Design a protein around this ligand. Sequence first.
Ligand SMILES: [Mn+2]
Ligand SMILES: [Mn+2]
Ligand SMILES: [Mn+2]
Ligand SMILES: [Mn+2]
Ligand SMILES: [Mn+2]
Ligand SMILES: [Mn+2]
Lengths: 116, 98, 99, 99, 115, 108, 83, 87
Amino acid sequence: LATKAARKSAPATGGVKKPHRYRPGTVALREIRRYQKSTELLIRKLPFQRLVREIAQDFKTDLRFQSSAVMALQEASEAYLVALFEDTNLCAIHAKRVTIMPKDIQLARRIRGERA
Amino acid sequence: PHRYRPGTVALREIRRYQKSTELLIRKLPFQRLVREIAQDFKTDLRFQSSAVMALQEASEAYLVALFEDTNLCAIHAKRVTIMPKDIQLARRIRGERA
Amino acid sequence: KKRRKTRKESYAIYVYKVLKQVHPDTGISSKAMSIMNSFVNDVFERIAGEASRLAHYNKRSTITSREIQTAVRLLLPGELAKHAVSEGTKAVTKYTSAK
Amino acid sequence: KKRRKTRKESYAIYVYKVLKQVHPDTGISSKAMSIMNSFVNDVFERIAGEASRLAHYNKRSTITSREIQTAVRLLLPGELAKHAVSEGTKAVTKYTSAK
Amino acid sequence: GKQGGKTRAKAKTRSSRAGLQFPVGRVHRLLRKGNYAERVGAGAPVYLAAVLEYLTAEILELAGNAARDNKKTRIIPRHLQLAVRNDEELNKLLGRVTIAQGGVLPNIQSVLLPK
Amino acid sequence: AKAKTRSSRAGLQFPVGRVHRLLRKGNYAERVGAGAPVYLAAVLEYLTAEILELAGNAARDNKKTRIIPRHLQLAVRNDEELNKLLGRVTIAQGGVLPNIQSVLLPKK
Amino acid sequence: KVLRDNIQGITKPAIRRLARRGGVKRISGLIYEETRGVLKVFLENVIRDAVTYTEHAKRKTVTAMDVVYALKRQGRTLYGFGG
Amino acid sequence: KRHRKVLRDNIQGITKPAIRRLARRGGVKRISGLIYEETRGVLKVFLENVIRDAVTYTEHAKRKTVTAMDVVYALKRQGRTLYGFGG
DNA sequence: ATCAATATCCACCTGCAGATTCTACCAAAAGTGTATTTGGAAACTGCTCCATCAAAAGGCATGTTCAGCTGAATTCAGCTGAACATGCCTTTTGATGGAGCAGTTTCCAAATACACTTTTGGTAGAATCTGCAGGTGGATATTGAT
DNA sequence: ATCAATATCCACCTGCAGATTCTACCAAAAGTGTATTTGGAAACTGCTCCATCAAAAGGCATGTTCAGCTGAATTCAGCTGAACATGCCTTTTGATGGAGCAGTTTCCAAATACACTTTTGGTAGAATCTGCAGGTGGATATTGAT
Ligand SMILES: [Mn+2]
Ligand SMILES: [Mn+2]
Ligand SMILES: [Mn+2]
Ligand SMILES: [Mn+2]
Ligand SMILES: [Mn+2]
Ligand SMILES: [Mn+2]
């Protein structure tokens, strides 16, 4: 090559930019939308089964559990935790914040009558 | 002239009302209110004197506590002045609205 | 050895009949039916419970359609209570029409 | 002549007897007594209710002191319950042991 | 006088008489074995059965719609949750009840959305 | 034989014969054991003593002989366990416990 | 000042007294109307049940018993008017 | 030796991401770093309470096996009625 | 306001899990038909416990003035979210031994079912008293001003 | 800091209002003494269902880096509630018929209890459907840089 046009023209496609990022909070909303649509449980089944067994064993030893007794506990456990968060959220928002804090969790329960 | 600062008289009123137990709404107005509402449910009703005292006891007991929770909400929001937002939030978390 | 059965009643077939009445071409998973079954029993104990207490409150020893009716009114919210009562009375009236 | 009764049983005299055992020199407002009574009825109803349930769960026809015990274990907070169990067992034992 | 336990006429269920799908026979029976009152009259089960049936029709009509909405034919628990939580009255009635595998209604607080 | 009530035997003040009659006619079950009413009676009485003890004390603190509703309330909401046991229970003419959120006290 | 409404009968100083027992120090001007509404819902719910008990009892008078029973259902259990 | 492994610290099986998921369904957009430990505590208590009652129901039935029925009854006591497991 | 970069649809596809479908078996239901028991509607009648009036009483509505508190506006340290790399540990498919629920028969301890006797807690005045709530006096501790 | 105004204590003091002890009257419990019944425990044992092992693979969890933007701190004004001084309109406080809430007696519709006959829902085992969950691929939004 010696011809007319092409001479060390390395900077031709300058429109190709570097990386990509979602602004903080965009993904968090994507996830909310995501989990609010589903019903699958969200705590890893085995770890949960173990916590249950640990607690139970510390109230009474040598105990057995129906697979479903454990599922029943998980179902109740998350249903409870999820609702707790809805309230917690509301408290944070009341303080004109967006970040839930323990302070909110505790106010939610105080009003609810769990540690009032 | 003499004059107490805003929030002082309120403070000793808290101290006084917390100490006592007497009802605080005026009996007749309450009597009238209870009867007015009941008429919507069934007409020509008599109310045992004790039925009304019971309702008043329950109602005030209810309101006082709602004011407790309401206070916590306001304070939660770095305030001292309770507003409607505070009653509403509390009723939501309590399960009466949410 | 022996022939060891078990037996555990449900409202399943009945939930199903009604199911076919409202939406003729729709089905229901076993999990959902389990739930429908829980619901029915729940409401049943709630209504039967109300009735129970209502009867003692009045030194009554029998629970009749009348106890059930106010139990329903005490337990079911607005429009739903209104409709259950029509259905209840309806059924009772028709039942007693049998000579 | 007259002839008209009604009758109203109440836990009042047993309450009073107990007051005189703890604080022999302390009296009690009429309204205070009305609260204590309600209280005893309440706890009575709550306990019997729980024991009722225990029996059905286990397909049993009778509510024995075992039912009362666990019913108590469920209904009362830690210490209160611990003591109520011992008091309970004490009464029943003392009853059988001697007649 | 046992000449009656034979030919002609023939039985008819009580649900049949009431005009119901639900088990009047079974319901009346459950009322006795649950120790609610000493005695239980005949109309008691008929009524209760009418009410229970009625309510299940209400939840099923509502849930079946949720089924249609998500292009499904077999109602699943999520359809039950949606139906209940979207109906003010059913929501009230089952306000202390948790339907396993039902999830929650999608709802994001306004102040959480972007600019 | 010269009769002496069940209460006497179980060694308690509360009426065993009554708790029994109540349980039967309560529609809680088909049958009722001989010991259930005794057990239950013991429990009712015991808790009754618990509250009276505590309220008796409240009276003495307010320098009073006769126990009134306020006394029962102070006794109850001042005890972690009895308070939990009565958390959804409101005692008429009992009022509340003195308590003011610190954020509200005077600045100096 | 003559032609009154009943819920308006529950006056500002009364509501103010309630709040104080609740430990409130400063109160927004809008709390009174808000409170009256809460009280109305409270009374409505309870009385509806009480009167329902009244009617069932074939009575034309609401007894303290009816009020108590209604409260227990609201989960508002009250001591002092029965058992 | 017969059997048995010691169960301890399983509360940490409640992973940061699992709790973050729960919050999301709960409609929570942002979370303070101190929430994970709070939530663990709150849950431990929730569980002890249901398990206590449930296991109490068990011991009463003279059983060594906790059934769904146990859990279901323990939950109705706490006012947390669960549908779906033989109610 | 474009374009690029990802996420989000959304209908098409079909392989498997799980509904829906009979065959039959059977036991507990549920129903049908005399006989016996009784709970409560129903009519009255007395006796409280209400709703109505009047006078007699004590809190509320009002309007002014200013302290203080709530928000608004500004700033900035860092927490917390987004993304990325790596390696574990949950999830899954299977299979086994055996604890331990859950049937079944089988009795006796305990419980219901009258009947008879004794006692006792509730009630209705009737008289007796007593704890203590309002009232006083006067000291002293807060509160707010200068 | 020094009063000066109020509020808040403490010690008494005394009347009335609502606890007391008093007596006597039953019916209703509750105790006792037989008789008939039965719930449910013990003693097997058949047969779900739980605990436990294994072993391969993929989906998640952990840990780290980087900086957008969020909470928290500071400041400052307008303006919302608090405190205040009393007349006035309504809420207390009692008396006075009479409406119902209840004791009481009666009488039949409705509930039981008992014993056959009979219809029906639960289930164990196999056989055949069939919504639909994942897998794609590519058309359709939704962000975020610029
Ligand atoms: Mn790339
Ligand atoms: Mn100035
Ligand atoms: Mn790792
Ligand atoms: Mn004396
Ligand atoms: Mn200025
Ligand atoms: Mn004056």
